[PDB]
């Protein structure tokens, strides 16, 4: 045991101690048995933000012309450098263009941009924003991402999924870059720092299933027929609630299958906006430790999928203490899609196929075609077995590597 440690206050030399909770400033531990981390040491928020090369910096707007809408140098509010571009339009879309001084070759490149929403209103509170390349023949190629409330309320990088191409677009001979939106009664959005990242590697597919519905058993069989890995975005309270959600033993049995892995989705699915940041933090923490008790270990349990897709920088800041990467939600093919190299592990979305497989199978085919990563998701109650088989056969027939979220984060 020895004699008591040096110091004033209560000091004690113990042999063996047991506690429910220990708060320590310094802990000197000679041998640590603590595989179940709650707080992770890694802060992913700004690691990937400055990958690749800055293509358009917006630090001088002499090179930019408004096709439609209006543009100014924002010097009060800046993501990077001396200024950002403020895009403003009324009862219209915005579309702004920069002519390249020579033919750019963007073969195997992918695109990323800093964005903040000040205001968007009309038919929607939100807009697709499109990076829109123009070739030497006036064909377009389009990549896009979504400006939304919450997730867009503070500066955050989007990594742009492929969206569309005018047939015969010459990616080796790009002459103009365009940034554009849908039309709305009001648009006021800041952009900065377009970045180019190498995405010349193979296309990739990530499949997540949300909210631990009993249909995850059939999903495991179906995606198992081609060895595509499934992420269960898991809420540990939901286990054994009902016939409609997995039992604890079913969940453990599922995770024993080599293609099924679990990621956190909050103990009781507390989404941003619906609950306080403190309540969501408790849900995040309890989700993490309950899933760790179920055997979900480190690289897997470092991923979190936003409950109901809701998030903001507030939630990202809190989540960064517990998780490295998170995923939102979207309805369309470009929402699934990212370059293989992210610049934000927090702002990127997933394409739902609850409402039919079309946009997801488009995303899988575009992931193959344009060398991109597609993240597709469903709830196994919404989706029929034939729909799962359509998606599974789409993935197996396409030129993509099916991957885990862990693999994807290890590639960054």
């Amino acid at each position: 045991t020895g004699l008591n440690p040096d110091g004033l206050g209560r000091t004690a030399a113990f042999s063996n101690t047991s506690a429910e909770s220990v708060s320590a400033v310094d802990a000197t531990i000679d041998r640590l048995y603590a595989q179940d981390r709650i707080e992770i040491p890694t802060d992913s928020r700004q690691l990937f933000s400055t990958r690749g090369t800055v293509l358009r910096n917006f630090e001088d707007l002499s090179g930019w012309t408004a096709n439609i809408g209006s543009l100014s140098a924002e010097t009060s509010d800046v993501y990077v450098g001396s200024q950002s571009a403020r895009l403003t339009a009324s009862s219209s879309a915005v579309d702004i263009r920069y002519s390249f001084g020579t033919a750019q070759d963007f073969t195997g490149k992918g695109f990323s941009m800093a964005l903040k929403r000040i205001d968007v209103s009309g038919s929607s509170d939100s807009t697709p924003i499109k990076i829109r390349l123009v070739d030497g023949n006036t064909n377009y190629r389009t990549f896009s991402a979504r400006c939304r409330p919450g997730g867009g309320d503070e500066w955050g990088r989007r990594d742009f999924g492929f969206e569309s191409e005018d047939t015969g677009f010459d990616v080796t001979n790009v002459q103009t870059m365009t940034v554009t939106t849908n039309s709305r009664s009001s648009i006021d959005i800041l952009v900065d720092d377009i970045r180019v990242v190498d995405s010349s590697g193979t296309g990739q597919v990530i499949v997540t299933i949300d909210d631990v519905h009993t249909g995850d058993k059939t999903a495991a069989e179906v995606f198992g027929r081609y060895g595509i890995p499934i992420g269960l975005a898991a809420n540990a309270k939901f286990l054994d609630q009902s016939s409609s959600k997995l039992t604890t033993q079913e969940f453990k049995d599922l995770l024993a299958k080599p293609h099924v892995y679990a990621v956190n989705h909050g103990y009781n699915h507390y989404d941003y906006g619906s609950y306080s940041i403190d309540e969501i933090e408790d849900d995040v923490i309890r989700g993490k430790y309950e899933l760790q008790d179920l055997g979900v270990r480190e690289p897997n349990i470092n991923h979190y999928v936003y409950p109901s897709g809701n998030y903001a920088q507030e939630s990202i800041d809190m989540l960064s203490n517990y998780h490295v990467m998170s995923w939102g939600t979207g309805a369309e093919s470009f929402d699934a899609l990212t370059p293989n190299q992210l610049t934000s592990p927090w702002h990127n979305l997933r394409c739902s196929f609850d409402s039919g497989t079309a946009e997801a199978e488009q995303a899988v085919n575009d992931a193959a075609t344009y060398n991109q990563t597609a993240h597709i998701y469903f709830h196994s109650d919404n989706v029929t077995q034939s729909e799962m088989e359509s998606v599974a056969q789409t993935i197996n027939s396409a030129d993509v590597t099916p991957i885990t979220l862990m693999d994807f984060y290890n590639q960054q």
Partner: protein
């Protein structure tokens, strides 16, 4: 029923200023009125070894059993111990300087009955 105020039993201390490099404070329970002691506090001024010894002699230290209890480094206080010694069991506590230079040692505790 009968109410009594309990004040705690006799304070004990041993001290030495300027204990040379290899030299020691010998805490002897023969200095206690009750002839036994419990040292709670060792305030040490620099690095020390604490050692518990049994003597062959009733009244003087001739080492029989000796155990080095613990080593303390730098300056500070080990507080709230219960190292115990008595005259009749011929037990001594030695606090030996290990600092490479002179230190002040103050040891405090309580007298215990034999």
């Amino acid at each position: 029923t009968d109410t009594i105020v309990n004040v705690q039993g006799s304070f004990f201390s041993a001290s030495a200023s300027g204990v040379a490099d290899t030299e020691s404070l010998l805490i002897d329970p023969q200095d206690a009125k009750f002839g036994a002691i419990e040292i709670h506090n060792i305030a040490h001024g620099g690095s020390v070894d604490v050692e518990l010894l049994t003597s062959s002699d009733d009244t003087e230290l001739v080492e029989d059993a000796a155990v080095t209890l613990d080593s303390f480094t730098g300056e500070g206080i080990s507080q709230g111990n219960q190292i115990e010694a008595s005259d009749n069991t011929n037990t001594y506590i030695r606090i030996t300087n290990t600092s490479g230079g002179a230190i002040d040692i103050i040891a405090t505790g309580r007298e215990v009955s034999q």
